[PDB]
């Protein structure tokens, strides 16, 4: 099944953090990276001297169940994020989100698919449109139309 994963990081030097996260993604069992988007840049809110976020989307072929894939994205966040030596929330983070899983709709306590806010986030939708321009969401919404009708922040490549 094709899953779409969002990767986000404002950690350290973020290019190498996202490349590491990509490698770990491809190391997930029964799962294969099909395509990766360009890398995009999201500035922080505020005027404050804070690191920019690097955003990407990945198409991952997987024979795992969605909750299994979740286990693996949660593990990588821990193993590759600054949770142990810092905090869960901590301004600085590595985020791995399952945006889409096949045409599945999953509404459970530990997993909601499609990701609950992705239609509102340019930094998820634009990279996704780069690698899947003909995508249609499980509810029948066309990705191309959402991009013509919702207001997103300007989003430059990294």
Cα 68 versus chain centre, distance? 17
137/152 with CB nearer Cl ion: 137
Task: Kindly state whether residue 119 participates in binding Cl ion, applying the rule CB under 5 A.
Answer: no
Alpha helices in the chain (DSSP H): 14-26, 66-80, 122-131, 143-149
> How many of the chain's residues bind Cl ion (CB under 5 A)?
4
Task: Kindly state whether residue 138 participates in binding Cl ion, applying the rule CB under 5 A.
Answer: yes
Task: Kindly state whether residue 139 participates in binding Cl ion, applying the rule CB under 5 A.
Answer: yes
24/146 with CB nearer Cl ion: 146
Whether 77 and 95 have beta carbons less than 8 Å apart is answered as yes
Tokens at 87, concatenated? 């905090």
Burial pattern 93-125, b for ≥16 Cβ within 10 A else e, equals bbbbbbbbbeeeeeeeeeeebbbeebbebbbbb
Whether 57 and 121 have beta carbons less than 8 Å apart is answered as no
Residue 140: CB minimum distance to Cl ion, A: 8
134/139 with CB nearer Cl ion: 139
53/101 with CB nearer Cl ion: 101
Interacting stretch for Cl ion, rule CB under 5 A, among 9-17, 74-82, 132-140, 148-156? 132-140
109/139 with CB nearer Cl ion: 139
**Closest C-alpha to 2, from 64, 72, 94:** 64
Task: Kindly state whether residue 143 participates in binding Cl ion, applying the rule CB under 5 A.
Answer: no
Location of structure tokens 């499980």: 138
Please list every residue from 79 through 118 that binds Cl ion, using CB under 5 A. Answer: 114
Task: Kindly state whether residue 137 participates in binding Cl ion, applying the rule CB under 5 A.
Answer: yes
- Interface contacts to Cl ion, rule CB under 5 A: 114, 137-139
């Amino acid at each position: 099944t094709v899953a779409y994963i969002a990767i986000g990081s404002n950690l350290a030097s973020p290019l190498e953090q996202v490349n590491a996260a990509l490698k770990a993604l491809g190391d997930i069992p029964e799962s294969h990276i099909l395509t990766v988007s360009s890398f995009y840049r999201t500035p922080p809110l505020g005027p404050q001297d804070q690191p920019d976020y690097l955003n990407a989307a990945v198409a991952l072929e997987t024979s795992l169940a969605p909750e299994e894939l979740l286990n693996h994205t949660q593990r990588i966040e821990l193993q590759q994020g600054r949770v142990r030596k810092a905090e869960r929330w901590g301004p600085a983070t590595l985020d791995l989100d399952i945006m889409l899983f096949g045409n599945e709709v999953i509404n459970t306590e530990r997993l909601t698919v499609p990701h609950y806010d992705m239609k509102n986030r340019g930094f998820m939708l634009w990279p996704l449109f780069e690698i899947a321009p003909e995508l249609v969401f499980p509810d029948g919404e066309m990705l191309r139309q959402i991009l013509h009708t919702r207001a997103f922040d300007k989003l430059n490549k990294w």
